[PDB]
Amino acid sequence: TVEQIFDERYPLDKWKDSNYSILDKFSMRGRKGFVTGAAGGLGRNAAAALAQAGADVALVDLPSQEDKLTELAKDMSERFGTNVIALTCDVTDTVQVAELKTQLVEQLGTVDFAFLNAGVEEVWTRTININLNGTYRTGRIAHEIMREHGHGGSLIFTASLVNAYGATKAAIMEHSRYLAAALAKDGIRSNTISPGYVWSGIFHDAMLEVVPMHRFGTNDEIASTVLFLASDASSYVTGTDIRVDGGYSV
Amino acid sequence: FDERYPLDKWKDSNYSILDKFSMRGRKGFVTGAAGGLGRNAAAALAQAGADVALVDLPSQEDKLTELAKDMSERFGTNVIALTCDVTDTVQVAELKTQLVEQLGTVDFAFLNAGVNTEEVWTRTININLNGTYRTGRIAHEIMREHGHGGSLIFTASLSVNAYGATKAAIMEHSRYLAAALAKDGIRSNTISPGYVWSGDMPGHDAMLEVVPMHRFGTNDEIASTVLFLASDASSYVTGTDIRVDGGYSVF
Ligand SMILES: [Cl-]
């Protein structure tokens, strides 16, 4: 055993082995996790994508969204055959986040992935800091559970809706960079998704001339990128960002 | 607007997010295909359902021929070997014809440049770059001639200021292509690999000391990213880069 150690832990051609399957790397069978902002377009689509790929998922959003979370979770549980549950939490409330940690463990079993899907005078600077601490503490309990259960996982941070988004975006990105460096050894990856203009419904012509694809993204085009980053397909990807913006930045 | 941008595709029971990652019905090619990244990326695309041409130098014809068989057998798609010296525009012209003849069209390409006395270093780099640029070019010429979209993926890997110079040029090229070809339904992206193993135990932990994951990547860990960028899973992704480096850039 001198060279045949490097050959055991570093195959050059996994695809040669009949038991290797590239598509199974995008599967979430056996995996459990949660999605914040889950009553919204990005969150519930990401959650449905993970559930259809085989994960158990907790849908997390504000207590005021309970009935929507409960209906979405029943619908996904039925359509995809996994345990999708609803867990209300206002993550700016410390006690509720502590309770969420308990209920994730007690109702899911463990946490393998978290999609921390954050929503965006001197009032703005106060509310930016409040919502960032909410994001931070939610990611924190996610990786505490991972560590406490002795396994790895995947954290995915995003922010969606000018100075406020830019400052929030920069903060989250630096936050994910440090997590990626500090938790890599616990098997925990951290990445961000930076969405461009995504359709969300009425409640144009100018901003689409900016976008080289000349259209908006849909919620499912973010959801497929979340599945990549949450799945083993992205097992060597940490500390980075995926821009999903139709070319906006280019 | 109503019907153009659906909000919850998952509510259709004949929709699946996992079909986005399939390459069934797709055809394309991979350069540097005898090397680690290229053959692993070819095998990923073929396993996912694509017909694939393996392109590399004429000196690799036998390797490519065996690789094409290995993958045709394992995955049931048409995988072929096409040698080409891509610094020769005549050969690249013939490569374009052979691709259209033997595959039917090109939907994706993984342009996988290798790296690699002052005048000579700059000349070597620019010849290498230009080989990448023109194989990229025949790919989107074929897409546009045949009236459909596609996906281009560019990477440079070791085969350091020469590597850095090559990486910056390819990134600019892909940014330009992504802007220019979006109208034609053609995406272009890059992959930036970190330390990937392709064949001393303390010299091991030596360079891993600045990799947070404290291990080398493996060729399959780049292949799966190639598959993500080639498939409809990344349909709103263009003009950007995916770094696959085990945390190297955030140490
Ligand atoms: Cl959050």
List residues of A with catalytic annotation: 160, 165, 169
Tokens of A183: 């938790």
Q: What are the DSSP calls for A154-165, one per residue?
A: EEEEEEE--HHH
* Chain discontinuities in chain B, listed by preceding residue (C to N exceeding 2.5 Å): 116, 159, 199
B10, B223, B240 member nearest A45 (Cβ): B10
Distance CA A136, CA A140 (A): 6
The C-alpha of B240 sits at a distance from chain A's nearest C-alpha, in angstroms, of 7
User: Tokens 């931070």 appear where?
Assistant: A136
Distances (CA, A) of B42 to A40, B39, B92, B116, B167: 38, 5, 20, 21, 22
The answer to whether B104 and B27 are in contact (CB under 8 A) is yes
The C-alpha of A171 sits at a distance from chain B's nearest C-alpha, in angstroms, of 15
Q: How buried is residue A200: exposed, middle or buried, by Cβ count under 10 Å (0-12/13-18/19+)?
A: middle
The answer to whether B233 and A47 are in contact (CB under 8 A) is no
Distance CA B150, CA B68 (A): 23
- In degrees and rounded to multiples of 5, residue A40 shows phi and psi of -80, 175
The answer to whether A105 and A146 are in contact (CB under 8 A) is no
Closest Cα partner for A119 from A63, A54, A76, A61?
A61
Distance CA A228, CA B74 (A): 24
Q: What are the DSSP calls for B43-110, one per residue?
A: HHHHHTT-EEEEEE-GGGHHHHHHHHHHHHHHH-S-EEEEE--TT-HHHHHHHHHHHHHHHS--SEEE
What is the DSSP-derived secondary structure letter of residue A103? H
Distance CA A86, CA A162 (A): 32
The answer to whether A116 and A155 are in contact (CB under 8 A) is yes
Q: For chain A, how many residues are written?
A: 250
**CB pair distance less than 8 Å for B238 and A223:** no
- In degrees and rounded to multiples of 5, residue A116 shows phi and psi of -90, 95
**CB pair distance less than 8 Å for A237 and B216:** no
The chain A residue lying nearest B235, using CA atoms, is A221
The answer to whether A131 and A92 are in contact (CB under 8 A) is yes
Closest Cα partner for B31 from B97, B99, B77?
B99
A16, A177, A242 member nearest B242 (Cβ): A242
The answer to whether B63 and B54 are in contact (CB under 8 A) is no
The answer to whether B161 and B118 are in contact (CB under 8 A) is no
Buried b (16+ CB within 10 A) or exposed e, A51-76: bbbbbbbbbbbbeebeebbeebbebb
In the 3-class helix/strand/coil scheme, how is B3-26 assigned residue by residue? CCCCCCHHHCCCCCCCHHHCCCCC
CB-based contacts of B161, cutoff 8 Å, min separation 6: none
Tokens of A110: 């463990």
Helix axes B118-146, B161-181, angle to 10 degrees: 20
Tell me the three state secondary structure of residue B150.
Answer: strand
The answer to whether B158 and B115 are in contact (CB under 8 A) is yes
User: Tokens 């929709």 appear where?
Assistant: B15
Give the alpha-carbon dihedral of B36, B42, B45, B46, to 10 degrees: -130
Q: How buried is residue A247: exposed, middle or buried, by Cβ count under 10 Å (0-12/13-18/19+)?
A: buried
Distance CA B113, CA B181 (A): 21
- In degrees and rounded to multiples of 5, residue B235 shows phi and psi of -65, -20
User: Tokens 């153009």 appear where?
Assistant: B4
For A210, left (φ over 0), alpha (ψ -120 to 50), or beta?
alpha
The answer to whether A13 and B40 are in contact (CB under 8 A) is yes
The C-alpha of A185 sits at a distance from chain B's nearest C-alpha, in angstroms, of 6
Q: Using a CB-CB distance cutoff of 8 angstroms, which residues of chain B are in contact with residue A247? A: 178-179, 182, 238-239
For residue A10, the number of C-alpha atoms closer than 13 Å in the C-beta half-sphere is 17
Candidates B167, B192, B231, B234; catalytic one? B167
What residue ranges define each of the domains in chain B, with the CATH number in brackets? 1-251 (3.40.50.720)
User: Tokens 């999609």 appear where?
Assistant: A115
Helix axes B61-75, B36-47, angle to 10 degrees: 30
Closest Cα partner for B31 from B149, B173, B148, B129?
B129
Closest Cα partner for B225 from A188, A247, A232, A250?
A232
The answer to whether B7 and A48 are in contact (CB under 8 A) is no
Number of helices and strands in chain A (H, E)? 8, 7
- Who surrounds ion ligand 1 at CB < 5 A? A 36, 116, 118, 135, 138
Distance CA A220, CA A93 (A): 30
- Give the A:B interface size as CB pairs under 8 Å: 213
Resolution (angstroms) stands at 2.2
The answer to whether A135 and A171 are in contact (CB under 8 A) is no
CB-based contacts of A78, cutoff 8 Å, min separation 6: none
How many angstroms does the Cα of residue A138 sit away from the middle of ligand 1? 6
Distances (CA, A) of B99 to A32, B55, B56, B96: 44, 10, 13, 5
Q: Which residues is A159 bridged to in the sheet?
A: A118
Experimental determination approach used: X-ray
Q: What are the DSSP calls for A205-220, one per residue?
A: HHHHHHSTT-S-B-HH
Q: Using a CB-CB distance cutoff of 8 angstroms, which residues of chain A are in contact with residue B194? A: 236
Tell me the three state secondary structure of residue A10.
Answer: coil
Closest Cα partner for A139 from A168, A117, A109?
A117
Amino acid letter, A217: G
Distance CA A49, CA B16 (A): 8
Closest Cα partner for B87 from B138, B123, B127?
B127
Pairing of strands A153-160, A113-119: parallel
